[PDB]
């Protein structure tokens, strides 16, 4: 079955629309590809290392080619012969993160709402069938469309992400969090000057919550960058 | 003359509203203060060094007090006995930057539209007269309201900001810009790994333009962070 969706019966605006795709199963993971194009989180460390150098940089997407711009509506592949028509929502955003050993990418991505359960890697195309993005992560019924558009960036480091959930109202610093802001400064006094080298590269950190945060820290927990996220969902983001 | 505005005749919705302020003149520059609270860019390097430790961290604002939240309307001081009522616009945004020798702050700030020409430092208050912010920068008729609200962050470094204006469509990396993505890759290969120490702290870089960018770089221009700005104006931001 060349079906890129888990549920047996289709849901939503379905239309006849052939979009090629390839299916893979490794251990218990099942994912889809679009030629060379795969989600970064669906690759073995061997696959990640070989693709890091030959790829364009989209969050959690490996691809040897530039993706088409987004516009107002896209089609998501259901079968070899059918696809789902969905509006792109630039007001409901999801935060993506990824690492390929070279760049720790992040993106405040737009979404579309489907009640289907698409495989990671499912192709997303425009009216002309040009690949605009690939299914990566989902929060509820909202799937993240990783693209150039929207707020985004990347950290130059080999280190993977640290994904943390600080308690509500805590004063975040580095990979740590503290109950009071004064204690933050106390901990600030005890640390040395920030140190980065080839030996000890920086550490990317994502703090999920109501006050979401993107932080870059050195090996010792000293902060290099701190970024207050707004308008983006961070909690319960599932990588399919 | 206790006027916090340059133009001789008031414009806009003027209301009776007494707001304390002090006027200062250094060289040919004239700005206002609110007790301790002043704009960072209005300070001598000696004044900056003294306030860095005694301050709360708002972009281009020094203050010994926590700022009141941003409601929907604010009042801006014209003279000792009158002030202007202006609507706060969260959809037309301006990018702010500042440095105090400890934090290189940036902020996507909301704006208000006045035809008055306010001094830097003019107090901005809510209905209760609580200090909500201070006049810092403006683009055209749109003044930036520096607050906690909105997207923002800071870099830990002593270095000042580096402000560049790359040509349209160029591929930005670090402090340089290149014609295509390919040249960035070539330039990437010739560089060592980023090096940061107490001796060589990071460099904050702002790239203004259509695709505005926030970058953290080592002393030699190797990139540590890269951030694609969206939804904020960067080009004609004037620090009053
Ligand atoms: N600056 C800022 N921008 C925001 O958008 C924001 N949204 C919420 N809050 C919270 O309001 C309370 C007021 O402090 C804090 O609890 C704060 O949450 P937090 O963000 O968790 O706190 C970390 C402290 O820690 C501060 N530091 C970070 N680095 C340093 C440093 N090298 N030296 C001294 N202080 C440092 C950091 O600026 C800060 O303290 P200050 O605001 O007083 O400056 C914000 N604070
Ligand atoms: N990734 C990305 N996100 C965006 O939001 C975006 N908006 C516009 N563009 C431009 O589209 C063309 C696509 O290439 C580029 O001209 C690009 O302009 P730029 O974004 O201004 O140039 C930086 C190049 O340079 C890349 N690099 C950055 N650091 C490295 C590094 N260590 N090693 C290899 N490449 C690095 C950076 O990823 C990139 O190259 P990629 O094509 O691979 O994305 C974007 N690119």
Numbering used by the authors:
A (entry chain B), B (entry chain A): 1 to 240
Manuscript text:
Poxviruses are large DNA viruses which replicate exclusively in the cytosol, and encode poxvirus immune nucleases (poxins) to degrade 2′3′-cGAMP and prevent STING activation. While baculovirus and lepidopteran poxin homologs share <25% identity with VACV poxin, they are functional nucleases and retain 2′3′-cGAMP-specific cleavage activity. New poxin structures include the alphabaculovirus Autographa californica nucleopolyhedrovirus (AcNPV) poxin from Group 2, lepidopteran host poxins from the moth Trichoplusia ni and the monarch butterfly Danaus plexippus in Group 3, and the betabaculovirus Pieris rapae granulovirus (PrGV) poxin from Group 4. In spite of dramatic sequence divergence, poxin structures from each group reveal a shared core fold and head-to-tail dimeric architecture confirming poxins as a single enzyme family.
The new poxin structures trap a post-reaction state following 2′3′-cGAMP cleavage and allow direct comparison with the catalytic mechanism of VACV poxin. Unlike the catalytic triad of histidine, tyrosine, and lysine residues essential for VACV and AcNPV poxin cleavage activity, the active sites of T. ni poxin and PrGV poxin are divergent. The T. ni and PrGV poxin enzymes share the conserved active-site histidine but lack a tyrosine residue entirely. Instead, both proteins contain a second histidine residue adjacent to the first, which forms a contact with the 2′ hydroxyl or 3′ phosphate of the cleaved 2′3′-cGAMP molecule. In the case of T. ni poxin, mutagenesis analysis demonstrates this second histidine residue is essential for activity, suggesting this residue functions as a general base to deprotonate and activate the 2′ hydroxyl nucleophile for in-line cleavage of the 3′–5′ bond. Further, the T. ni poxin protein shows substitution of the VACV lysine for an arginine residue, whereas the lysine is conserved in PrGV poxin. Unlike mutation of the lysine residue in the VACV and AcNPV active sites, mutation of the T. ni poxin active-site arginine to alanine only partially reduces activity, and a charge-preserving mutation of the arginine to lysine results in even less activity. Analysis of the host T. ni poxin structure confirms a relationship with protease enzymes and demonstrates strong homology with proteases derived from (+)ssRNA viruses. Unlike the degenerated domain in VACV poxin, comparison of the N-terminal domain of T. ni poxin with the yellow fever virus protease demonstrates near complete conservation of a dual Greek key β-barrel fold common to serine protease enzymes. A nearly identical pocket is conserved on the surface of the T. ni poxin protease-like domain, in which the poxin C-terminus is also coordinated by histidine and aspartic acid residues.
